[PDB]
Ligand binder design. Structure first.
Ligand SMILES: *[C@@H]1O[C@H](CO)[C@@H](O[C@@H]2O[C@H](CO)[C@@H](O)[C@H](O)[C@H]2NC(C)=O)[C@H](O)[C@H]1NC(C)=O
Ligand SMILES: *[C@@H]1O[C@H](CO)[C@@H](O[C@@H]2O[C@H](CO)[C@@H](O)[C@H](O)[C@H]2NC(C)=O)[C@H](O)[C@H]1NC(C)=O
Ligand SMILES: *[C@@H]1O[C@H](CO)[C@@H](O[C@@H]2O[C@H](CO)[C@@H](O)[C@H](O)[C@H]2NC(C)=O)[C@H](O)[C@H]1NC(C)=O
Ligand SMILES: CCCCC/C=C\C/C=C\CCCCCCCC(=O)O
Ligand SMILES: *[C@@H]1O[C@H](CO)[C@@H](O)[C@H](O)[C@H]1NC(C)=O
Ligand SMILES: *[C@@H]1O[C@H](CO)[C@@H](O)[C@H](O)[C@H]1NC(C)=O
Ligand SMILES: *[C@@H]1O[C@H](CO)[C@@H](O)[C@H](O)[C@H]1NC(C)=O
Ligand SMILES: *[C@@H]1O[C@H](CO)[C@@H](O)[C@H](O)[C@H]1NC(C)=O
Ligand SMILES: *[C@@H]1O[C@H](CO)[C@@H](O)[C@H](O)[C@H]1NC(C)=O
Ligand SMILES: *[C@@H]1O[C@H](CO)[C@@H](O)[C@H](O)[C@H]1NC(C)=O
Ligand SMILES: *[C@@H]1O[C@H](CO)[C@@H](O)[C@H](O)[C@H]1NC(C)=O
Ligand SMILES: NC(=O)c1cc(I)cc(I)c1I
Lengths: 170, 411, 339, 48, 48
């Protein structure tokens, strides 16, 4: 730090009080600056660690204590649950999610015209297997016969773009 | 300094380097030659007129002489001149031969031997208060030598006078030669000396048998400025030719440095010698001989990076010069493999037209990897797989199955 | 804002320039320069890390469908156009135009800075004083490609590509599902499909007009750019401080003083310039923490507003969130929140 | 901060310009360091 | 907590008080006081 030596013992051994005072002052200033730099870096890293810990606490609240509907907050896919595990200076979250596997093409329609009225699924999507029209949930292919219980009527058939014609069978 | 890999090893303070890219020191350019540019002056400075003068002035009426257009080769004083005191303040003595001095003034007078200590920027006493004061920021050299063989008389030399009884302390470099009667008491004088009225000037004794503290001492104070103005007094340094468009060490009127000198469009005013930028660095200089303005540019420029696969894997390295076409070049070593990516010239790495995941991030979309004869390969990193969603206005994709996926997040 | 300027400092060049005596004296410090460079390297790595988290959420590049039949919705304005040399959208072109970078590129040759241009060009002075700017790992074209892939996945598949295995769906049905998500029956979507498409197109045109006008509205990214440039220029300007020495120029001290007398002045200058570098690095660390927080927020918004429909109030715009569209911008991302 | 006194008035009263310059420089460096530390801590607390 | 105390520093008054010699010596630094005040002004604006 600009002093004749970095060792206080050498300076005190070869210099008297007055001459060694300036060297010791230089060393003190340098080492105090080093300590201040270390403490500032520690403060910045502590702020970053605090942000990470706040995120971890939020994830434990929302992924472990409940089922989160936020996308990609508790893993990739539709979040089912999460399990915490302790780790040195941290937490590991095992995110059990639901991932669609085997997609299949289907012919769909926004609405179906039955008796001059437009019908809608109100829970899923209309699909066709070439000849007949069923209604199925969006995340899993479970076709069901289109009845009045899984559809609702709204207006006429001349307003919906893409409406198709299908006869409801008892 | 053997190679940039060794520089990376020294920077990391280890003998092993992990895979990655490391910034090294900027591209250094060493000066090739050294040039000295002083104005052509042949006359020696009047050392005889100053230090060999037959008569010296009194301290209260100290003489000031201008020194200009001469070579300050003080070694000529070695043969005949012996100085008891020689103290320089704004400049180290050993540098006096390599410098040019702007406004040289020699102040000559004679004092007592005991009063020589008073010729200093921050001294008090009779001479420092009432006769001759140096400024606190004085730049120059004080020289004093015993002159008992010259300024002493057997009956007593009373031709040298000093000012006593002044009303107030003198300003720096101020001369007072008034002979008004000093009023010490409350009774006011009327030009007559008596009681509390004293003549302000008193003469030294200066006898040959006087003690060394009461023997005459001749004092010359040289005052000047350094490295700020044209200057016309220079040391005994021989000038060389002017080398331009090349990294050289330069000595312009005592101002030393390293850089590249180029012809400048700046128009210096007649009183200006140096030009300085926002950082106070000398970026322009007027040639003392050709009177032309030259821009000075630092030799070192450009960032350098070293890409290594890891010393445990191979000793091969690639060098990235971040400010260069692989269009001699400003490269430490060039051979065979040059790619010229964005972010600089890449030397020592092969280039392929394929795209892969990034391994060593070079930057600007370019990455490097140690791949197979193993070698460093530079490529454009791939953003991922490319496909099309079979979009249609009456087609849907519905999952017929699912996967239970468990993934780990570390916080 | 997503990322800030990556910088590197050659401490020997900044503190000492080309002086060998100053370098020898600075060798007694040693570790502080390494500490500063390690902090700067961490910041530079974190910048590309932030960019990767924000824009590389999906590793599967979906490019634009050719038909572009989305039930009256017009996305040719936020989708890239092949006519431009850069495959970026027109709105992305506006955003690029409204943010002025410090330098056009990241390579400035010695010949360009050679001469009187060094004293007038700020970048030239920064580079001559040992301050270098490192380019981002991802180019603007690559970020635009990532944004285009996200847009194509959102338009063609909706929310499914955010959970993997992008499932195609007609855009009208996707809008109906989003309407159901915000609590409105889907028939309202179908009975007013023309009106909703026209309103969306008009809002896109209003964004057009707002960005093409003299109003900037992109001051957040320009502030980051200006802060980095100001920090570098302040670092350059602080080299004129004497720090208690007789001069702020090492050359003058070495020219007028011998080794012993010049040692104390050079030590004072070294201490002052090291303090300046430490202050710059500390400010860069604080700004990097702030930029990292902003980039984490941007990544969360891309996950929850673009890859899905968020039910959080005022998280993806004002009103009931329907969808969002990402757009690349210099050192940042612009989210178009359709509510 | 290594100076003979922490009071500028005492240094200016007992020392001339040249001798007091080094003490005032030491005091200036120390107080500037104190201000810089305060501002850095304020920046960190402002981020929090 | 939402906001913290907004502060400003007169560096000349803190370092030098009413000393003219100290102010003249501090003029050699200059930019550090401006940097500190710019950071403090940024914090003060961020509070509101
Ligand atoms: C320079 O000259 C002025 C004026 O002649 C001096 O000031 C006078 O000082 C005396 C006592 O020292 C007073 O009695 C007068 O009233 C002052 N007059 C004025 C107009 O100020 C001053 O002291 C001189 N400076 C030096 C260094 O000799
Ligand atoms: C989608 O919007 C673009 C505008 O960005 C439409 O292109 C405009 O078309 C009109 C006439 O059709 C021209 O007068 C404009 O100059 C075009 N603007 C451009 C090209 O920027 C485009 O037609 C719209 N798409 C549909 C299907 O209407
Ligand atoms: C609901 O709002 C829409 C849009 O704000 C209205 O549609 C506009 O109606 C005015 C007449 O008041 C026409 O001049 C505009 O051309 C219409 N805009 C479009 C895009 O068609 C609509 O009338 C309002 N009311 C209902 C019942 O829909
Ligand atoms: C005649 C006036 C010349 C002015 C020269 C100006 C600046 C050059 C500096 C110093 C020259 C005088 C040195 C006297 C002592 C020499 C060494 C010795 O003998 O111990
Ligand atoms: C649906 O059909 C398209 C072509 O029309 C095809 O590219 C796509 O793979 C099909 N999807 C499935 C799940 O088979
Ligand atoms: C469609 O499904 C019905 C009932 O599931 C079945 O009777 C019919 O054969 C199917 N048609 C085709 C083409 O798969
Ligand atoms: C899809 O578009 C075609 C245009 O060729 C149209 O004939 C058809 O009815 C549309 N179908 C739906 C479901 O919108
Ligand atoms: C459905 O029925 C209506 C009313 O008869 C008719 O106008 C329309 O063309 C029919 N659609 C198809 C696809 O046959
Ligand atoms: C000074 O004078 C002496 C005697 O006259 C002479 O020997 C000497 O060379 C002179 N020195 C100079 C520098 O003129
Ligand atoms: C000497 O310097 C003058 C400038 O005053 C210049 O005009 C002249 O050419 C120089 N002579 C030589 C021989 O360099
Ligand atoms: C190198 O210079 C050439 C001019 O011939 C220019 O085209 C190129 O852009 C420069 N290098 C880079 C990385 O831009
Ligand atoms: N990951 C890579 O970069 C890479 C991988 C393989 I396998 C082959 C090659 I050539 C490369 I350049």
């Amino acid at each position: 730090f600009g002093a004749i030596s970095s060792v206080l013992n050498d300076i005190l051994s070869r210099l008297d009080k007055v001459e060694a005072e300036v060297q010791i002052d230089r060393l003190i200033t340098g080492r105090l600056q080093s300590l201040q730099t270390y403490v500032t870096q520690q403060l910045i890293r502590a702020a970053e660690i605090r942000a990470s810990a706040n995120l971890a606490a939020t994830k434990m609240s929302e992924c472990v204590l409940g089922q989160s509907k936020r996308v990609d907050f508790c893993g990739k896919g539709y979040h089912l649950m999460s399990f915490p595990q302790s780790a040195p200076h941290g937490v590991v979250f095992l995110h059990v999610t639901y991932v669609p596997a085997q997609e299949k093409n289907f012919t769909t329609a926004p609405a179906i015209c039955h008796d001059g009225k437009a019908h809608f699924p109100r829970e899923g999507v209309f699909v066709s297997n070439g000849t007949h029209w069923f209604v199925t949930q969006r995340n899993f292919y479970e076709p069901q016969i289109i009845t009045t219980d899984n559809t609702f009527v709204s207006g006429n058939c001349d307003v919906v773009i893409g409406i198709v014609n299908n006869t409801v069978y008892d | 300094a053997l190679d940039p890999l060794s520089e990376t090893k020294c920077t990391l303070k280890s003998f092993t380097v992990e895979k990655g890219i490391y910034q090294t020191s900027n591209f250094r350019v060493q000066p090739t030659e050294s040039i000295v540019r002083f104005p052509n002056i042949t006359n020696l400075c009047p050392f005889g007129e100053v230090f060999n003068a037959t008569r010296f002035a009194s301290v209260y009426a100290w003489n000031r002489k201008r020194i200009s257009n001469c070579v300050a080769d003080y070694s000529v004083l070695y043969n005949s001149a012996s100085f008891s005191t020689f103290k320089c303040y704004g400049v180290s003595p050993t540098k006096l031969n390599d410098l040019c001095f702007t406004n040289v003034y020699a102040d000559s007078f004679v004092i007592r031997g005991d009063e020589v200590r008073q010729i200093a920027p921050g001294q008090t006493g009779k001479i420092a208060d009432y006769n001759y004061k140096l400024p606190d920021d004085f730049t120059g050299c004080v020289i004093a030598w015993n002159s008992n063989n010259l300024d002493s008389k057997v009956g007593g030399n009373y031709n040298y006078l000093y000012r006593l009884f002044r009303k107030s302390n003198l300003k720096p470099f101020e001369r007072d030669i008034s002979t008004e009667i000093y009023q010490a008491g409350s009774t006011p004088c009327n030009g007559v000396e008596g009681f509390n009225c004293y003549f302000p000037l008193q003469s030294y004794g200066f006898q040959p048998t006087n003690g060394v503290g009461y023997q005459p001492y001749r004092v010359v104070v040289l005052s000047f400025e350094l490295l700020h103005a044209p200057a016309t007094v220079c040391g005994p340094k021989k000038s060389t030719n002017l080398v331009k468009n090349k990294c050289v060490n330069f000595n312009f009127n005592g101002l030393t440095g390293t850089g590249v000198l180029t012809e400048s469009n700046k128009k210096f005013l007649p009183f200006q010698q140096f030009g300085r930028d926002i950082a106070d660095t000398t970026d322009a200089v007027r040639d003392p001989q050709t009177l032309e303005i030259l821009d000075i540019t630092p030799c070192s420029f450009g960032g350098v990076s070293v890409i290594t696969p890891g010393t445990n894997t191979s000793n091969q390295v690639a060098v990235l010069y971040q400010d260069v076409n692989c269009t001699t070049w400003r490269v430490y070593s060039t051979g065979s493999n040059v790619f010229q990516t964005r972010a600089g010239c890449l030397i020592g790495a092969e280039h392929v037209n394929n795209s892969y995941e990034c391994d060593i991030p070079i930057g600007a979309g370019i990455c490097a990897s140690y791949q197979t004869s193993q070698s460093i390969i530079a490529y454009t990193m791939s953003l991922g797989a490319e496909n099309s969603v079979a979009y249609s206005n009456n087609s849907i994709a519905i999952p017929t199955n699912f996967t239970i996926s468990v993934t780990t997040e570390i916080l | 804002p997503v990322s800030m300027t990556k910088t590197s400092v050659d401490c020997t060049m900044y503190i000492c320039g080309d002086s060998t005596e100053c370098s020898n004296l600075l060798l007694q410090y040693g570790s502080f320069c390494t500490q500063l460079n390690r902090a700067l390297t961490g910041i530079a790595v974190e910048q590309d890390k932030n960019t990767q988290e924000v824009f590389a959420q999906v590793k599967q590049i979906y490019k634009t469908p050719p038909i572009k039949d989305f039930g009256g919705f017009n996305f040719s304005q936020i989708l890239p156009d092949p006519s431009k040399p850069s495959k970026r959208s027109f709105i992305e072109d506006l955003l690029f135009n409204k943010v002025t970078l410090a330098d056009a590129g990241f390579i400035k040759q010695y010949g360009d800075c050679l001469g009187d241009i060094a004293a007038r060009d700020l970048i030239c002075a920064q580079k001559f004083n040992g301050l270098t700017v490192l380019p981002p790992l991802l180019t603007d074209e690559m970020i635009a490609q990532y944004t285009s892939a996200l847009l194509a996945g959102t338009i063609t598949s909706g929310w499914t590509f955010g959970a993997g295995a992008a499932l195609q769906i007609p855009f009208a049905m996707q809008m109906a599902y989003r309407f159901n998500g915000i609590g409105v029956t889907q028939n309202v979507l179908y009975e007013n499909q023309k009106l909703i498409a026209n309103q969306f197109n008009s809002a896109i045109g209003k964004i057009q007009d707002s960005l093409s006008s003299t109003a900037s509205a992109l001051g957040k990214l320009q502030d980051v750019v200006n802060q980095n440039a100001q920090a570098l220029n302040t670092l350059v300007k602080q080299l004129s401080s004497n720090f208690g020495a007789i001069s702020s120029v090492l050359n003058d001290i070495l020219s007028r003083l011998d080794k012993v007398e010049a040692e104390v002045q050079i030590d004072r200058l070294i201490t002052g310039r090291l303090q300046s570098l430490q202050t710059y690095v500390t400010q860069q660390l604080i700004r990097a923490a702030e930029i990292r927080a902003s980039a984490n927020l941007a990544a969360t918004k891309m996950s929850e507003c673009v890859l899905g429909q968020s039910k959080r109030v005022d998280f993806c715009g004002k009103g009931y969130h329907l969808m969002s569209f990402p757009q690349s911008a210099p050192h940042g991302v612009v989210f178009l929140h359709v509510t």
